[PDB]
Description:
- By secondary structure, the first copy, chain A, is an alpha+beta fold.
- Chain A is built from ten helices and twelve strands.
- In chain A, the strands form four sheets. In chain A, strands 1-2-3-5-4 form a five-stranded antiparallel sheet, with helices on both faces.
- In chain A, strand 4 and strand 5 form a beta hairpin.
- In chain A, helix 3 crosses helix 8.
- Chain A is globular.
- At the A-B interface, helix 2 and strand 4 of A face helix 2 and strand 4 of B.
- The site of one ligand NBR has 14 residues of chain B, from helix 9.
- Chains A, B: Its EC number is 2.7.1.32, 2.7.1.82.
- Chains A, B: Belongs to the choline/ethanolamine kinase family.
- Chains A, B: It comes from Homo sapiens (Human).
- Chains A, B: GO terms for molecular function: ATP binding; choline kinase activity; cholinesterase activity; ethanolamine kinase activity; protein homodimerization activity; protein tyrosine kinase activity.
Amino acid sequence: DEQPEPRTRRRAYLWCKEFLPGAWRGLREDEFHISVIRGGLSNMLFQCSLPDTTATLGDEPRKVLLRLYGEAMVLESVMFAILAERSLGPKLYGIFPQGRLEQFIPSRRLDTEELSLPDISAEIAEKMATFHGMKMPFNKEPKWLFGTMEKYLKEVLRIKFTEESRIKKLHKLLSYNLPLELENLRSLLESTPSPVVFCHNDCQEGNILLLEGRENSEKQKLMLIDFEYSSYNYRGFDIGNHFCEWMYDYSYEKYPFFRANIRKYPTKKQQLHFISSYLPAFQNDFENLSTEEKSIIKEEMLLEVNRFALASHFLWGLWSIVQAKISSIEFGYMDYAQARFDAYFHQKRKLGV
Amino acid sequence: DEQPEPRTRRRAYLWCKEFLPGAWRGLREDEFHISVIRGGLSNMLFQCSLPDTTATLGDEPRKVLLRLYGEAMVLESVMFAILAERSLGPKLYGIFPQGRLEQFIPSRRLDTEELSLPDISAEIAEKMATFHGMKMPFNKEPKWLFGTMEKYLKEVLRIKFTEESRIKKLHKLLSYNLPLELENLRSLLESTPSPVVFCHNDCQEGNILLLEGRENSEKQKLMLIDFEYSSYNYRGFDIGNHFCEWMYDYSYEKYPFFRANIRKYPTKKQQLHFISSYLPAFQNDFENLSTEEKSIIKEEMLLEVNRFALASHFLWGLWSIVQAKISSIEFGYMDYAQARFDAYFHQKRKLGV
Lengths: 353, 353
Ligand SMILES: CN(C)c1cc[n+](Cc2ccc(OCCOc3ccc(C[n+]4ccc(N(C)C)cc4)cc3)cc2)cc1
Ligand SMILES: CN(C)c1cc[n+](Cc2ccc(OCCOc3ccc(C[n+]4ccc(N(C)C)cc4)cc3)cc2)cc1
């Protein structure tokens, strides 16, 4: 168990002692347990717990997660609290300017290869449909997708890299005429109906918990977490983005720190499986429709999500160029951008668009 | 219906159109209805509605309340959202840097004279007991009461007024040796057990809605609102503060814009009525205790709340001196401070403390 810095141990102790009820309120510092889950300069994570020799007095948690950040803060905090109330996220035990105390959920993250297991995929779809029914106190105009793409496009155009390979790679990505391609994509998506729903916007394996002790259970073995990029957006984006994430493995241990495989995109059969779980979770009398009406709804959704998958590639390709300029994480951002653009044109070839 | 300024109408229209679903998303500006509920430079309130000629498409509200403000913002927003989720406050429809959109609750505020009606008092007690059971993600150390009193005491000591009557009045209030009196109060309250609960801290008639159409109902005719000063604090403060508010009427239409009457404090009989509704709402098997045990719990609570009532006087007396220095509202702050201190020493005489 990696121990935090002394300053961090002391602050964590104080936050626990003051924001948690019951035994925590009287806990001795020399009996406080803390270990690092994720280090870094931002969004550091720690597990904090009572000693085994201290009894619970009421319903207080014995262990919590501390997130340190290291207005978007109001929106994210409100969102987190609401999801907690609704039993769709970890409980919220404490909020303070430096961070928050969250329910500790014994789990691991999914690996990329697990996203295609039929029971896993079906549950993700159900979870996403549930998330998409959330009414949330946020702007409902679906400006997020193309607003963010336009923002990132204008930033990318102005980047001045100093390192040769990044200069070269950028020149290649910008050679596609990104302003025109963005508007070609806008025109396509303007003629692709997709309801506006509350989207996660990052439904990748690293944001999906496999709950400890539920690994052999039929259903209800996952939790979708890490909602910080959620917004009202087109349903098609969230689903298409998920499908895209089948192609990328971020656990690759050498440069560029990911692996990409175009052949791992879900087949239409796999997509139909996902869609067939999504739809009755999103409209519960769906099951009562005729076979033919279910069939047209599913076919329309296949086209919808595969078209919107293009926007996942375009948006996250542009994002990754911006990260190559601004990030402080070691990751092959330029190579990832090229993988996304390569997949964008591959999918465009496949769609006939 | 007082109309807002054109800029405000336009912003309100945009906030409604973008944060509310259904018919609002397509509403014409020339059919948007808005009127001012409360003006001012801070915390302005407006009612906003669909025209009667526009149909609801789903479950969207036809009318909302707009609050404009004109980190405490994170905490207050999180608190509001959580209370809304739990059905203890108005629903939260939109949050943005300038304000929020809230559920519109047809109602009026209570008048001071209504606080003593036995059914009203019993319901307030039930509502307060319910609020006091809230688990909330805020600091649980009860530093709020004396921390705030110390802050305000140090500020009051340093005030330099320029206007003669305020100079004179301040000299009189400070002549009591407020540092020593604060510590006398601390010593008394240190020997008065009172559980730490989530307190409203401002349970006055102006924060209690009488729900339209429930005015002749037995129960469930009120809503406690305006939670912005809530904090974990001693239960005794919230109850004692409420009792204090029986003495003050803030609707008096001439200077000093309140009336005070020491004889309107609840009698012990009235207090027992309030307590007898509070306790089974706060500990639901209370009713199953013996008569003698119920009797000792009630007697202990009478002493607890009447002692803590002293802290309502002291704290809000100090607050009102600070407002005489910093406020921009026309209100007889110095006279109100003197009324609170007069009541502090009256209650101390009555208690024998
Ligand atoms: C903003 N948003 C909602 C997005 C943005 C981007 N994407 C696509 C995307 C998703 C995950 C993603 O990276 C996931 C994290 O992967 C990491 C990989 C490596 C590292 C660092 N690293 C370097 C070296 C190393 N070794 C020593 C082996 C281990 C880890 C950190 C994170 C990158 C792009 C989706 C949504
Ligand atoms: C911070 N906190 C939780 C507190 C602070 C103080 N107190 C005690 C207190 C409560 C209410 C209170 O004032 C309530 C509002 O009363 C007003 C009265 C008059 C006005 C302004 N005014 C002036 C002139 C006028 N006429 C033209 C007749 C009408 C209104 C505004 C508000 C003053 C002290 C409790 C809790």
